[PDB]
Write a protein that binds this ligand. Sequence first.
Ligand code: ATP
Ligand code: ADP
Ligand code: MG
Ligand code: MG
Lengths: 47, 493, 50, 464
Amino acid sequence: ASRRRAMKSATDNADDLIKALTLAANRERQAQITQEISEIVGGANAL
Amino acid sequence: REEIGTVIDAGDGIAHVEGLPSVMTQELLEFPGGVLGVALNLDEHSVGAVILGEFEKIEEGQQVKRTGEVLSVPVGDAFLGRVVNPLGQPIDGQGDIAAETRRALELQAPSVVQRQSVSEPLQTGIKAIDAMTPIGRGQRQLIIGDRKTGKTAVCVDTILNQREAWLTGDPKQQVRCVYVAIGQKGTTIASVKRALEEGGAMEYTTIVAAPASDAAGFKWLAPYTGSAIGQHWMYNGKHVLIVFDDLSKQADAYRAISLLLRRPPGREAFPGDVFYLHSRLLERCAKLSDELGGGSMTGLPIIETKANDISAFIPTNVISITDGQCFLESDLFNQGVRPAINVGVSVSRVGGAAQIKAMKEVAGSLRLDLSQYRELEAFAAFASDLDAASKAQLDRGARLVELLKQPQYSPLAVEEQVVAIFLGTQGHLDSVPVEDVQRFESELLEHVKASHSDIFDGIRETKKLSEEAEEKLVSVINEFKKGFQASDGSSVV
Amino acid sequence: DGQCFLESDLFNQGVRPAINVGVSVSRVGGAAQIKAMKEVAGSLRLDLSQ
Amino acid sequence: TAGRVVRITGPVVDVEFPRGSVPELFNALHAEITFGALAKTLTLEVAQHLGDSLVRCISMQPTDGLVRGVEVTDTGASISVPVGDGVKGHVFNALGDCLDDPGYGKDFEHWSIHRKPPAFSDLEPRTEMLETGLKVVDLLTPYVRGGKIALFGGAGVGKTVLIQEMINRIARNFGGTSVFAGVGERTREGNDLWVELADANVLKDTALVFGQMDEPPGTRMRVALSALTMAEFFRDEQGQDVLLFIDNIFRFTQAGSEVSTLLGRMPSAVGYQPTLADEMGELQERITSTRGRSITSMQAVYVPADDYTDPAPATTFAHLDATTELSRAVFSKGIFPAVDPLASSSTILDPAIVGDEHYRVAQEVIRILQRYKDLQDIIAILGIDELSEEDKQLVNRARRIERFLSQNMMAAEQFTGQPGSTVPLKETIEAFDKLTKGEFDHLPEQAFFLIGGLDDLAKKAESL
Ligand SMILES: Nc1ncnc2c1ncn2[C@@H]1O[C@H](COP(=O)(O)OP(=O)(O)OP(=O)(O)O)[C@@H](O)[C@H]1O
Ligand SMILES: Nc1ncnc2c1ncn2[C@@H]1O[C@H](COP(=O)(O)OP(=O)(O)O)[C@@H](O)[C@H]1O
Ligand SMILES: [Mg+2]
Ligand SMILES: [Mg+2]
């Protein structure tokens, strides 16, 4: 019984960690996209 | 008489010409030494032009003449069994090609009122997609994945599967084949041509190729000439299948040629209009109505992706454009599944009306236990404690997933595919070691071609199965099961 | 022709030199060393990495 | 007709000519530096045509000390290099000047350096086999005679030592001729390689040419063309099997990048030039060997920032066959051959071409390694006891497999202090079949480290 309870708690602890990691990855990807597009447009219009 | 200009600039395959007040857009131009050019950017001062062919033969004193022609290509019916560059010249030394008509590359696609529904089978040799995601005439399917997964093998197998259909003289079943090779190594072109030739299918197919050495911009417009070649037959009540080896390199070439001149860059330095190019290229394939003649064209594009990033610009655009999708995972390829195709996500959006009714019956049963095995794979460790139904589902899923894999350069007939799938889904795989599952059935299949070939003829004629057919099959199965010897001992039911 | 990597984690951990043997190499290797050191030392770097 | 310089800015120069005397593309021009401290003869290569009869040119050697108004002389032809069999056995400059002795071979025949690739009709596939004596290469990524071979990996992985080992393994006892080129390499390596070649008896039949990192960008994108010119002459005229060695071809691309900004070309996604693919394709097409003649070319490429999604390596992957890949994790965990078995493959492997036992063994071992990887991903945290007997058996077998996959090497014996060895192909396949069977489970993994063959396995196991 204790094993059942602990394993359930472990799953309920893992899911939200997955969600937070997904959010962080998404914001990082958006920041990267903005960074390279800004760099390329600046290099292009610097001429 | 004709207007003549000069040259003001030259570099990186770009030339600027001052003059030619009457020039029209996308008009082919002539340069000394037999050099071809294309006008692509007009202006009041001068006009830009990309250089076709020789480059280093350009200076500031050359004279320019206009051909008074927009764009065209000989589209005769003698191109079968020949290799041709995108412009139209034959690469081989076999000699020139007789031609009958000249058509442009910028014709309008058939309208809405000229369309028609799709119900024809368009069978292929790969049993992994026929029963999973049907493909029909005039329908667009895409294959996506990583490098070294095996997509070109599937392409060539589909190409060479049409031998039996071409054998008959019926013009209502013959299918022409067009292959476009873009930005590849010449040795690979030679190898695939040799494979087709030894397969005997070179008599009804054509190849247009542009190797990696074509810096002239030939990589920009190879699919256009391929589609122009196909359309002449497709307007004559004849069925054509066209394959594009790759499209990412086409986009890269367009991006480079745009960046070389002045073009505002968007995401990833891509030029202003990329989606429009692929849309207008891929909207030519269509099943015409009965009034127009009934011809059809079926296209197959190819896209390469990095690190399974299906969220990039070009893959997203192509997925939005296309009509059906198939996915290949390198992890599955390393796992041991030769058809790395992933049944989890690949979906064809047609209604399943293309396929024939028997395989329509069996695919529904296949889907359920495929999903059951996919979901119940985690309990392999504690399989003893599970329920009998769960164990049966797991074993059936294992046998099924073992059944699908096939070796390359081995197309399968539709009767053979139907028989194999029916044998798999009726529980006849019980009491059989999994490994021998790959072997046994094949040998069994051969026996059917030896003494009981009438079943294939009945399936051909009726497109269905009868009670006498199924009882004959079960009798034959019971006969052969005892004859076959297992690799480890023996066991029968 | 050679790199030495120092990470703050090892320095915090309690290793005063604070250098990791995993990604520190030398092109010349045993040629520079005196011979006696060459026989005494041996392939200690590989043992440490293992 | 001389013309004059108008602008000087870094490596790029701007020249003007009288009307009608504008030189064609890819020509060569001469300029003089009169300063006492540094006297040179600048050679300029025209690369951009402009209006008003002005031309943008690139420099070949550093341009410090030049001024305005200096006249320029036109050659009227592209750069040319000496040819013939009388050049081998000497070290040459990028322009062909002999380092060992100036004014040597200047009477030889010299011809063009820029030519078109051959026609498609003469092309022909080449399927063959050649032994190497290395466990990984002979099993997973077999090579081929007359094809192309490349070595991929990041910085600080051990590419140069593998190149030296390969030349020691193959160039020795070879019937034909070998040509080696050095692009953007460490000068110490060039010197010690020259000394090592002089030590043996192969320098009498080898031609060396290379430019160093200290040279301006003009040189870093021209030496490969000279090497290809020499190889093409030898293949076309004398007609024997030849070997070609190129190091860090990626530097060539870098040579363009800076000039791409000076010439006014807009930048690409990662600051690259917009037209890299065309030039690299022209080079790789020039590499090709037609039927009736053989060229065995081996190259090494450098992965920037350990990222495989960079635009440049994609074209290298496209123009290739039978490649090898070096990773960083195996180097970190102390495995000298840094090849990654799960990211390298060869085209030649085929049950019809090579055989069935070889194919089945390779499939079994790669599947076992994949299973070990995705099992370790969880066992690293949940512990060993979380799995069944079969999983633990597979993990142990895989551990022994990656331990045994390493070997001792010729050129690296000084670091280990013990000379290496080579192994036959049949012994390798039999030993790996036995390992897949599961017989060596009674031995410790430490016996499998840095071993060669099976008798050495027995001796080392009995030593403990
Ligand atoms: N069904 C199959 N059975 C066995 N081997 C296969 C099968 N399909 C492909 N292969 C092999 O897998 C490899 C993939 O070759 P292929 O050129 O088709 O790959 P790809 O994913 O299209 O990559 P690319 O076009 O970049 O080379 C080849 O060695 C081929 O022989
Ligand atoms: N078999 C080996 N034995 C010992 N050291 C090796 C071996 N292979 C590689 N190395 C190490 O790799 C280094 C050489 O790396 P190098 O080829 O210069 O990297 P890069 O090609 O990125 O410049 C040497 O310092 C050497 O210690
Ligand atoms: Mg392929
Ligand atoms: Mg190195």
